[PDB]
Write a protein that binds this ligand. Structure first.
Ligand SMILES: [Ca+2]
Ligand SMILES: [Ca+2]
Lengths: 153, 153
DNA sequence: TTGTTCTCAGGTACCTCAGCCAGA
DNA sequence: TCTGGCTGAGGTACCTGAGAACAA
């Protein structure tokens, strides 16, 4: 497990709290046991003009990708393991997104069991609802309620 | 002069590089000796729902004010002295806005003499152009050329 | 079936200026 | 004459979702 220095993590938390995003999503998918796929994402958005600053993040964190769309780029990290390691080290220094990070860490750790029973999956889905509630959510569609009404059949 | 905790400056530097703004402006002023007044401002913008976060800055930096402009609030610091003290301590940790901080610091230290010669004032005004060049400038009107055009007989 | 990569975009929440006015 | 406390806004640059496809 990669260990990050504290000066790196302090600055990064400030940058994440400002321009970053901690995202949990439930994605409709018929081929999945409970008809949905859980998706966790850490994101940093920045004008493509400064894509390099995001590229440095890849190098410095040791993983992730940079995507472009129009005039804006994103560093993204969604691989569960690395995500867990990074977030665990980052969360003590977060101020605006501390709870989201903690909610994500709790979803990750409970993932195995959530895959065994619908009630447990629905439960993890409510933690996802909470992340979205803390975020400035504006176009959310699939929620724990969606999942509940589908399993009720 | 207040000396700030280092953990705090690092976090803050990340937040400033994210949601903050280091700005220099030349304001046409009828009374001012050279027909213009210099304004240096440090801003942190955040949705009014998170005004408390800006309020804590007033407490932690020990100076400045918080204003409401719609659904959005801003922490603002523009008094020269306190601004100089704050920025000189922040600037080593800044990444995206280190240049602007340093140009502002240079302007501040040159303020006494810029009031003397008009060439010196136009000089300071070019350092203002550079801060604006480094920013995502979109609606800037008064520049050093503008001032140049005014100072004539 | 599952984890993940990659792209698009809705709706702001920022950013970075503009300018006034009272007191000093 | 100068400075600092106020306010309003143009034009994005973000945030936080959506969804398709591809391994494994
Ligand atoms: Ca922000
Ligand atoms: Ca930003």
């Amino acid at each position: 497990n990669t260990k990050y220095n504290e000066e790196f993590l302090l600055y990064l938390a400030g940058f994440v709290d400002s321009d970053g995003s901690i995202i949990a999503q439930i994605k409709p998918r018929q081929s999945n046991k409970f008809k949905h796929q859980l998706s966790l994402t850490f994101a940093v958005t920045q004008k493509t003009q400064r894509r390099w600053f995001l590229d440095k993040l890849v190098d410095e964190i040791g993983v992730g990708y940079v995507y472009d769309s129009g005039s804006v780029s994103d560093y993204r990290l969604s691989e569960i393991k690395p995500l867990h390691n990074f977030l665990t080290q980052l969360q003590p220094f977060l101020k605006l997104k501390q709870k989201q990070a903690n909610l994500v860490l709790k979803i990750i750790e409970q993932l195995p069991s959530a895959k065994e029973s619908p009630d447990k999956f629905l439960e993890v889905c409510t933690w996802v609802d909470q992340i979205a509630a803390l975020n400035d959510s504006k176009t959310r569609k699939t929620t724990s309620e969606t999942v509940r009404a589908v399993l009720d059949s």
